[PDB]
Amino acid sequence: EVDKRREINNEHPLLMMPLYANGEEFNQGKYTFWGGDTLTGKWENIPDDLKPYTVIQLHPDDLPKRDGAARDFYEHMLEEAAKYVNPKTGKNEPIPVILTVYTAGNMPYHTSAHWLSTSWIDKMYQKYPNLHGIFSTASYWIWANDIENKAADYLKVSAKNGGYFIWAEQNSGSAIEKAFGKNGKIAFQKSVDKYWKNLIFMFKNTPAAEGNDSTTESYMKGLWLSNHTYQWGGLMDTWKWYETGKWKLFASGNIGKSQGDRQWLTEPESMLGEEALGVYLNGGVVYNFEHPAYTYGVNNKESLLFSEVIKEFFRYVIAHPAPSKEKVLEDTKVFIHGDYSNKGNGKFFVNVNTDREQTPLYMTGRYNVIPAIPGVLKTDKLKESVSSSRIQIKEITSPEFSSTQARKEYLNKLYPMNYEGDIFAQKLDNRWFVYNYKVNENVKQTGKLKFNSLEMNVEFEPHTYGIFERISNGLKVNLNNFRTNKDSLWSNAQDANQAKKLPQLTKKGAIKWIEEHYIKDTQFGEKRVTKIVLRGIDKLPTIHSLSGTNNSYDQPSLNFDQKNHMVTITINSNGNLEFELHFLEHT
Ligand SMILES: CC(=O)N[C@@H]1[C@@H](O[C@@H]2O[C@H](CO)[C@H](O)[C@H](O[C@H]3O[C@H](CO)[C@H](O)[C@H](O)[C@H]3NC(C)=O)[C@H]2O[C@@H]2O[C@@H](C)[C@@H](O)[C@@H](O)[C@@H]2O)[C@H](O)[C@@H](CO)O[C@H]1O
């Protein structure tokens, strides 16, 4: 084993920071990124506490489809990253980089990345110590004849150099199963056997109309737990709103895939945090997002989605490392072996822990994410673990998994019910994680959670998540319901028929919209109410360390009922929010 170029694990998570090459400006002799970020400017503006955990991911986007274009662009940027000088100290501090080397099956009619050989990649790894890995993304829809063979070579060249091969893929058309050798292409399977410690596998939730969210994330988790990948994560993509044909928030009717650039702006900001929780809460540690202009920002500035949701969330997972592989293994009661493609794909979990076929969210944390691996793999390395002796390893073809009812009946006997209410909740140590699981329906949800004898009832509007931690002197609360008003994008359309016929915003139009109406002159959403009720309280709680998104919240209201030893907390907000409540329990 060659020394790893960086650590990626629960204590050292990874936020990938995408920069998409501007192919049009490249033809004009310029080296630039769509959205106006610059390599140096972007890096400098990453907060210093995040710098150790963030890596610039170059993507060749629409660079010309011919030999030399991607190499030329990439070498230019690697040179800039390598020569970076910290202006605060004057020292040369090379910027860590990942190169996107494979995408869209590397078809010469799809991507300039086709003309990046393994020899060139080896050469860059040897020249640039700051090149930490290479990235393959989104070939599920164009599964090239040699994709597994190429993947094997990418992992091996990364291992050779101590870097990481990162592959983001969704289980559309059995992609994850094929990658590990389902259809007899076994080169990557053999590669993984030798080099799994340099592999990161992520979901890519883009193709949302196919509903493979739950099954792909299950695989990513199970691959990790069974030592087929070093760590896992997900790429969470606001393009899901386009794929599923949604338009104005909560509006009725479906417009299909007809208004791409309005659509990828519309996903509520806080909902990305809800998606990211499914990674964190299940031991995943790698995070990436599209569309980059909305999810990260433009012109070296943070978008509000980034500043108020993603940055906060990522800081959270650094401060509170995700459950270790050992811990997840200890908590795992069922591990599935077999192919979800032969059991309805995403339908497998519908009305088990997901509320519909097309959603990136869960409706209960009761089973958290049930881990699985494709039928083609073996559970040998899983069973070798000191931490796996209490796991039921089951074939997906078992009668326990044959229908929706059978799955719930079997899982319920092994995963006890641990809260009440129709709402998402999952518990980790002294922390309750809660979210409203509605995607595009304006319906409040409620739940009742317990910290031993202390009862906490919550009421949440859609696109709201909370983390509630029982601390020695009370309760720490982190809340996030940040959702700006996107209606202006859908103005002039009173129904789906008219919405579908709006003039295209276009890629350039959307980037301009972000600059003019999101980075500034933002149409913030209305403050909305969250209720928290605590029962079993001695005296009126006191509030401490209250902060949140600037100008986004009213002072929380506490109403203590002495006779019933209970407090009703009413919050009116739209943003991120944090405080502590200090109290003693009534005994
Ligand atoms: C769901 C799916 O499989 N779609 C295929 C395309 O892949 C992605 O799909 C998106 C629509 O859901 C969208 O077209 C993505 O590209 C736009 O957004 C990115 C940033 O998010 C860039 O700005 C792209 O330039 C832009 N494309 C256009 C035409 O303006 C697309 O994601 C991109 O392409 C894939 C292959 C991968 O490289 C991603 O990392 C990258 O962001 C796919 O591109 C399309 C091509 O014909 O086919 C769809 O079936």
Q: What is the CATH number of the domain that holds 476?
A: 2.60.220.10
Mark whether 378 and 289 lie in a shared domain: no
Map residue 524 onto helix, strand or coil.
Answer: coil
Q: In angstroms, what is the span from residue 105 Cα to ligand 1's centroid?
A: 13
Angle subtended at Cα 163 by Cα 157 and Cα 169, rounded to the nearest 5 degrees: 80
Closest alpha carbon to 154 in 137, 141, 171: 137
Total domains present in the chain? 3
Contact 239, 204 (CB under 8 A): no
Closest alpha carbon to 10 in 367, 478, 327, 389: 327
Query: What contacts 35, CB < 8 A, 6 or more positions away?
Result: 20, 292, 293, 297, 298, 299, 511, 514
Instruction: Answer with the one of 523, 552, 573 that is the final residue of a domain.
Output: 523
What are the E-state strand segments in 179-308? 199-204, 231-237, 286-290, 297-298, 301-302
The token pair at 457 is 């009832």
Q: Which helix (H) or strand (E) holds 529?
A: strand 528-535
Q: How was this structure determined?
A: X-ray
Chain breaks in the chain (C to N over 2.5 A) after: none
Map residue 483 onto helix, strand or coil.
Answer: coil
Closest alpha carbon to 58 in 37, 27, 44: 37
Residue nearest to atom 33 of ligand 1 (CA): 61
Edge-to-edge strand order for the sheet containing 528-535? 445-451, 454-460, 528-535, 566-573, 557-561
Residue nearest to atom 47 of ligand 1 (CA): 110
Q: In angstroms, what is the span from residue 239 Cα to ligand 1's centroid?
A: 9
The token pair at 573 is 């907000």
Ligand 1 pocket, CB under 6 A:
20, 34, 59, 61-62, 103-104, 137-138, 141, 206-207, 239, 242-243, 290-292, 507
Q: Which of 61, 114, 272 has most ligand 1 atoms within 8 Å of CB, for mutation?
A: 61
Mark whether 448 and 366 lie in a shared domain: no
Resolution value, angstrom units: 2.0
| Calpha distance 451→431 (Å, rounded) | 9
Q: What is the largest CA-CA distance in the chain?
A: 77
How long, in residues, is the chain? Answer: 587
Contact 253, 495 (CB under 8 A): yes
Mark whether 441 and 558 lie in a shared domain: yes
Instruction: Answer with the one of 389, 417, 445 that is the final residue of a domain.
Output: 417
Mark whether 506 and 566 lie in a shared domain: no
DSSP at 24: H
Q: Residue 5 phi/psi, 5° resolution?
A: -75, -25
Which domain CATH number covers 395? Answer: 3.30.2330.20
Q: In angstroms, what is the span from residue 215 Cα to ligand 1's centroid?
A: 22
Contact 82, 94 (CB under 8 A): yes
Angle subtended by helix axes 147-161 and 187-195, to nearest 10: 20
| Calpha distance 248→315 (Å, rounded) | 31
Closest alpha carbon to 53 in 266, 322, 252, 267: 322
- Count of helix runs (H) and strand runs (E) in the chain: 19, 24
Closest alpha carbon to 357 in 478, 465, 256, 208: 208
**Ligand 1 atom with least separation from CA of 62:** 25
Strand 465-471 and strand 431-435: the pairing is: antiparallel
Q: Residue 510 phi/psi, 5° resolution?
A: -65, -45
Which domain CATH number covers 133? Answer: 3.20.20.80
Each residue of 505-523: b (16+ CB within 10 Å) or e?
bebeebbebbbebbbeeee
**Ligand 1 atom with least separation from CA of 240:** 12
Contact 280, 322 (CB under 8 A): yes
Mark whether 412 and 423 lie in a shared domain: no
Q: Which of 206, 238, 242, 257 has most ligand 1 atoms within 8 Å of CB, for mutation?
A: 206
Please report, to the nearest 10 degrees, the dihedral formed by the alpha carbons of residues 476, 562, 464, 203 taken in order. Answer: 50
| Calpha distance 198→347 (Å, rounded) | 32
Mark whether 502 and 576 lie in a shared domain: no
Mark whether 173 and 232 lie in a shared domain: yes
Contact 189, 182 (CB under 8 A): no
Amino acid at 92: N
Map residue 314 onto helix, strand or coil.
Answer: helix
**Ligand 1 atom with least separation from CA of 242:** 12
Map residue 531 onto helix, strand or coil.
Answer: strand
Terminal CA-CA length for the chain: 57
145-148: Cβ within 8 A, 24+ apart: 147/102, 147/105, 147/179, 147/185, 148/178, 148/179, 148/181, 148/185, 148/186, 148/187, 148/188, 148/189
Angle subtended at Cα 458 by Cα 456 and Cα 463, rounded to the nearest 5 degrees: 145
The token pair at 541 is 């709680």
Mark whether 496 and 425 lie in a shared domain: no
Instruction: Answer with the one of 377, 396, 417 that is the final residue of a domain.
Output: 417
Edge-to-edge strand order for the sheet containing 424-428? 424-428, 431-435, 465-471, 474-480, 576-582, 542-548
Amino acid at 27: N
**Ligand 1 atom with least separation from CA of 291:** 21
* Chain position carrying tokens 């030893």: 565
Tell me, letter by letter, the H, E, C secondary structure of 74-136.
HHHHHHHHHHCECCCCCCECCCCEEEEEEEHHHCCCCCHHHHCCHHHHHHHHHHCCCEEEEEE
Mark whether 362 and 214 lie in a shared domain: no
The dihedral sign for the CA sequence 304, 310, 316, 319: negative
**Ligand 1 atom with least separation from CA of 34:** 23
**Ligand 1 atom with least separation from CA of 243:** 12
Contact 174, 148 (CB under 8 A): no
Mark whether 172 and 284 lie in a shared domain: yes
Angle subtended at Cα 385 by Cα 165 and Cα 181, rounded to the nearest 5 degrees: 45
Contact 59, 21 (CB under 8 A): yes
| Calpha distance 459→531 (Å, rounded) | 5
The token pair at 299 is 């012109």
| Calpha distance 242→260 (Å, rounded) | 5
Q: In angstroms, what is the span from residue 262 Cα to ligand 1's centroid?
A: 15
Q: Residue 270 phi/psi, 5° resolution?
A: -60, -30
Mark whether 112 and 135 lie in a shared domain: yes
Each residue of 191-220: b (16+ CB within 10 Å) or e?
bbeebbebbbbbbbbbbbbbbbbbbbbbbb
**Ligand 1 atom with least separation from CA of 237:** 21
Write out the residue range of the structural domain in which residue 345 sits: 324-417
What are the E-state strand segments in 323-444? 334-337, 372-373, 392-395, 424-428, 431-435
Q: In angstroms, what is the span from residue 96 Cα to ligand 1's centroid?
A: 25
Cis peptide leading into residue 291 (ω within 30°): yes
Mark whether 154 and 64 lie in a shared domain: yes
Map residue 213 onto helix, strand or coil.
Answer: helix
